[PDB]
């Protein structure tokens, strides 16, 4: 009997169904996502792959993987990937933001510390603070001097919880 | 690696498993109590020592070299020892 | 590197410490059929089960290579290869019949170590140890 | 100075009494150990003469039960006869070949020649006649008249070790009695289930199917052979499930919508179960649920 | 849990379960329809067959040195014949 | 072992070694030609950035959880400086 | 899990390790002993209490909670309290 | 730096050299051991291998090696190995002779049992003692009735010893 | 059955007893140049080495996949895969240098297990079981 | 508030004394730290400014330094001078770049300034010299006359240091000098050896060049790269064992019949050492040994 392992986290529907809107909203609606993927549970044939949000993190990418029927999660799971030319490896919740945060939401710039030392303004900001899971000390001290989206960002660290 | 031994009571020729640091104690509790013997109204008859009376660790930590498998010593019991057949 | 990392990153520390697991699921229904559908289930590759390590809701799952497009074991032996956190290990975590519990930890895997892509194991960790922070040029 | 013919006296009444299923003692057994090493050692032709005897009273009593068996003439009578002296002739045939160890030796033969015998004695002729009051007696029982188990389980029992085809053990038994089961059930669940489903209802049916399903998987695991479950119980439910819930799945999936839209918990539990059996039945209520989620 | 084991003349060489279980006629004998009985074999063969039981078992997966067997010859023909009958 | 990091007023705000090492400006100062001065940085400053050493240090491998570092905006801006220094 | 305390001497501001369950005497030993301070004439002032004489685990066993990274208690030393900088 | 781990039984010079002289005249003067076959070194590239005794098997074959250079066995060495069909597996002296008796040299027939107990002749006997390494109590007992080559026979146990 | 041997079987319950291994060899010669042609011989796949388990003859041996016609390691590593007395084991005895001395173990073989061969297994297990007294027809 | 012309003037003489080579002090060295960091920051050319300033400085010693070593006409007195103005400015560049890492982070670019600096100051025009002169002072090394080793340490750490080419480290060292070296060793044992083996004898020839193998090996362990070892010191000994024991194979072979019966101990470890250095020295020893056995 041949059988593959997978990590998953239990979360109740309500995270993963709010977790859906978001992306859909974002990705179509906003221009924050527009860059990623979406594979929805038809096109799917595995029985409990319900669906699949797909990050492209450039040269790699993240795949977020929901499931329908698990034992009394009806009851859902979430699994997190980083698939790279059929090399994949599994990812906790807080590297799989830290690595999404690395391209696509915009972030204080390599020139936003000099110019809030000396007073200027600052022109980029950091809607992904979730992102941020510790960091350099000019980081935190930059963030308390500087401190931070109405239709929330998609992150998987609100997700998997609970 | 412990050491075989085996009792010789009257007719009796029990066989049994006997531990290389093995006392009188436990020795008589269960070892020689196949044939439902406690140690009450009893006592071990080993050679013409008797191993003692009892509870005794002097002796009865025999070593395994002494009773090989292929000939390994007598005990004996009572509260007589039966010649085997001749050839 | 990753014959390091198991020594000092605390996912780890925390996962390879001898946990506890536990079989999740019918539990509203009796104990006997229960452990008869485990049984069953576990016997054959034609279902899946899954573990929670007796806590949170980080819980492994098994679901039969049919479904989708070293090996793994499932008597009482429960191995598991898989590439977690970008460093592989192995899962050896059995569980006890006639009550619908076990233990778990986890070992290093070697031979994927050995035998795995390194360009690909070399890029991902060049991209995990990055921060986007201060990185685009202004 | 030991010889066949000077104990062959002495070994042959014990020989028919643990052959003929009669009241025996130890020290006659361990006595009958010790002379059948004896004269299997000692004589030249000893142990041939033993099995030449031993087959001559195997044969005469084989003929002794068969001419016992086939007196009842009413197939009932015929049929618990045949159980009750199976049962003693397999107990025997359990017991029987432990003494002639030594004779194995030299040349188990005996549990073989046993069963080859009671099987071209009786089976040869009656098996027809086994299986068809088999299959009767167990549709008896599924419509609702409890009978005696025992007989049924010998009856399976006979088949899976009275096979004189030696590729296989249950070979025969597998590929008629087996075969002719699951025809047998598939029928009545065919003739049943529209039936209470026009009439009953519809979760009527449900419940029906499930009380059913469990009987049914209950008669298979005490019934049907379970030692080996050589393609025997899988097919058995495989085919219940696929004359009852494969059939009606088109109705199934039409009360789907309305479990969807009325959340009932015992068809929730059902089409949770009823996932598994079905290859591709996961679909409609999957799509269902989706409907629901758009 | 102990099997009895009565020779000839009545001596008894209760032996543990699990050496006797080593050799197939014992096996096929316990069976069926402890006490089993050994007219044939007296104590001067029998002592030495249960005591060969016992040596066979421990000295059986022990790879690195196992000693002979040194047994007269004086009761080497009987011995075989208790031999050929239990084991 | 330790690194003496003289504040400007004159606090020393000793560190243990292995944590003043995590800012590169630190490890290429005590290289070449403890004893280290900081006139720019005083100690509302100072004192938090070696506490933030301290913190970074040992919460830097925990993935659990890393609770936050509260620090007040009225001295966040001379601690961005003094990250933009040391860090 | 350990708690992060330091040590506050008139001019002197030592930061370091200290073990959950730490005793006054293993701490007075070497984690003060950065300034060549050895319990002989000197005692601990930790707050009012100044932790009793020594040799006490009730206190001394402080618990991880109330001290963290970035909030640490106070433990002070003498045979003053120099006051931070202020914005 | 590829390597193959290959267990060795540090043996004297001298055991190997009478071991080599027993084989060789067995194979060729006496009729024990014309069934074997013999490698020498120069057929054999591998810088350490000084002889290979072939001995085969029925179906597989036991193959012993002789070393030349070990570090202060000048120093040899031996490993036994139970070779088939690109299926090579190590094997400890004691078994390599028992499998090694299991085919050439001689034992007491089935019928070597109930013709010494009837006090009969035997006619086959076991010139290869050495090759029942504990046995059968029949075979003990038949062995101390008919107590047991002039250019003794070649062991793989007396070889490995020192 | 091999699962099964290990545990039973007494040559490897006299060998997996955390053994005491010795690198074997010019013990006539200078120590640091023992030591000097140990490092540079274990660094490099041009040489040969031998460790003897501290007081037996039984020694192992590593020679260079080249001069024949899973995989094995030698920092302090000395991963051995080897089918030992018919049974697969895995030997993971390191050694310590400036000494000249280490520890040894064996661990299954759970891969090769799984994955080498079953009939000629099962054909070396019969083979291996049966005795050559009483056999030929007489 | 803070530019660079504000204190550059206090920056200038610290900076001239961190690259002249003369005492410093630790609490300027801090200080130093500080402005360059504070004038990194505030000031918006500040950066620019500092990294010209540098270049400048630089450029104006390592003229200074080229001008005095470019006095000593005398190969001998150059060299001295070379390596000592060598081995201060490593030392300064080793010692420099740390207090401009703000620079860097902003834009180590220091110390490739001082290598290619000086590169394209001396060793640009000197290289063919100090390689002919190292290759002179080591062959008369070897010849006998010991001399200051930390020159030769220093020709060759310069070659190695100031390759400018970064496709690799130490390409130009290793693809010139090693390969001079290899060259000049080689000829040198050609000039050597049969003279020795025809005067002094066969086991006077055998401990000699035990001997010399051994002060090659120690002296290419101090002179040759050990850092990296890039295919520097395995093809210097192999070159050596190629010229010497392989060269004369033949006599090696013809006396290696005469040990056997006669049973040298010292031959015997030198042919076991020699066996893995020779292809396929084995056959002729253990062919030798073969006919002492058959
Ligand atoms: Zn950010
Ligand atoms: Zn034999």
Chains 1, 8 share one sequence.
């Not at chain 2, 412990?2 to 008589?28: G, N, P, Q, W, Y």
């Not at chain 2, 140690?39 to 025999?62: A, I, N, S, V």
């Not at chain 4, 068969?66 to 015929?78: E, F, G």
Request: proline share 4%.
């Amino acid at each position: 009997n041949r059988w593959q392992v997978m990590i998953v986290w239990q979360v109740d529907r309500m995270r993963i169904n709010t977790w859906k809107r978001l992306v859909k909203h974002h990705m179509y609606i906003s221009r924050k996502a527009k860059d990623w993927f979406y594979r929805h549970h038809y096109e799917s044939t595995h029985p409990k792959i319900s669906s699949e949000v797909h990050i492209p993190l450039g040269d790699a990418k993240l795949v977020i993987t929901t499931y329908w029927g698990l034992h009394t999660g009806l009851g859902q799971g979430v699994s997190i990937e980083w698939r790279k030319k059929r090399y994949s490896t599994q990812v906790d919740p807080d590297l799989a933001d830290q690595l999404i945060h690395l391209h696509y939401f915009d972030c204080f710039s390599e020139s936003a510390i000099r110019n809030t030392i000396l007073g200027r303004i600052v022109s980029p900001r950091c809607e992904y603070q979730a992102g941020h899971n510790v960091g350099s000390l000019q980081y935190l001290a930059l963030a308390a001097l500087i401190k931070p989206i109405k239709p929330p960002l998609p992150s998987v660290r609100k997700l998997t919880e609970d | 690696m412990d050491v075989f031994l085996m009792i010789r009571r009257h007719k009796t020729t029990i066989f049994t498993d006997a531990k290389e640091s093995s006392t009188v104690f436990e020795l008589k509790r269960i070892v020689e109590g196949i044939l439902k013997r406690p140690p009450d109204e009893q006592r071990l008859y080993k050679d013409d020592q008797l191993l003692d009376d009892g509870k005794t660790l002097g002796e009865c930590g025999f070593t395994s070299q002494t009773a090989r498998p292929q000939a390994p010593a007598t005990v004996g019991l009572a509260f007589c020892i039966e010649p085997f057949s001749s050839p | 590197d990753q014959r390091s990392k198991f020594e000092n990153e605390e996912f780890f520390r925390k996962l390879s410490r001898e946990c506890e697991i536990k079989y999740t699921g019918f539990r509203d229904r009796p104990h006997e059929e229960r452990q008869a559908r485990f049984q069953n289930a576990c016997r054959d590759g034609r279902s899946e089960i899954a573990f929670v390590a007796t806590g949170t809701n980080l819980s492994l799952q098994f679901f039969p290579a049919s479904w989708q497009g070293e090996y793994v074991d499932l008597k009482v032996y429960l191995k598991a290869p898989m590439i977690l956190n970008g460093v592989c290990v192995i899962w050896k975590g059995w569980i006890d019949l006639q009550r619908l519990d076990g233990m778990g930890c986890l070992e290093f895997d070697e031979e994927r170590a050995q035998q795995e892509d390194a360009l690909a194991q070399q890029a991902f960790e060049e991209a995990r140890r990055r921060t986007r922070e201060f990185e685009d040029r202004d | 100075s030991l010889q066949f013919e000077d104990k062959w006296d002495f070994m042959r009444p014990i020989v028919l009494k643990l052959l003929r299923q009669e009241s025996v003692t130890k020290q006659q057994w361990f006595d009958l150990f010790s002379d059948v090493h004896a004269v299997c050692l000692w004589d030249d032709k000893g142990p041939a003469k033993i099995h030449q005897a031993l087959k001559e009273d195997i044969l005469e009593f084989i003929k002794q039960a068969q001419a016992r068996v086939l007196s009842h003439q009413d197939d009932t009578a015929l049929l618990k006869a045949y159980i009750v002296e199976w049962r003693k002739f397999f107990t025997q045939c359990d017991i029987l070949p432990k003494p002639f160890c030594q004779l194995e030796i030299t040349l188990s033969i005996v549990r073989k020649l046993m069963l080859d015998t009671w099987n071209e004695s009786i089976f040869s002729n009656i098996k027809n006649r086994l299986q068809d009051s088999a299959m009767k007696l167990v549709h008896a029982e599924r419509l609702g008249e409890a009978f005696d188990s025992q007989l049924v389980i010998g009856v399976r029992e006979s088949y899976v070790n009275l096979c004189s085809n030696p590729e296989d053990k249950l070979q025969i038994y597998r590929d008629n009695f087996e075969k002719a089961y699951l025809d047998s059930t598939e029928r009545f669940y065919r003739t049943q289930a529209p039936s209470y489903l026009q009439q009953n209802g519809v979760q009527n049916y449900m419940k029906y199917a499930d009380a059913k399903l469990k009987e049914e998987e209950k008669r298979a695991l005490r019934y049907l052979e379970t030692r080996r479950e050589c393609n025997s119980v899988e097919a058995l439910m495989e085919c219940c499930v696929n004359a009852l819930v494969t059939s009606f799945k088109e109705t199934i999936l039409a009360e789907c919508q309305g479990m969807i839209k009325r959340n009932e918990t015992e068809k929730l539990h059902l089409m949770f179960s009823l996932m598994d059996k079905v290859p591709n039945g996961i679909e409609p209520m999957l799509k269902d649920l989706e409907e629901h989620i758009i | 849990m102990y099997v009895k084991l009565i020779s000839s003349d009545g001596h008894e060489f209760i032996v543990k379960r699990e050496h006797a279980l080593t050799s197939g006629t014992i096996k096929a004998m316990l069976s069926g329809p402890n006490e089993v009985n050994f007219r044939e074999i007296p104590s001067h063969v029998l002592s030495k067959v249960c005591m060969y039981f016992t040596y066979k078992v421990r000295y059986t997966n022990s790879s690195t040195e196992i000693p002979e067997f040194p047994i007269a010859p004086e009761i080497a023909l009987e011995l075989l014949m208790a031999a050929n009958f239990l084991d």
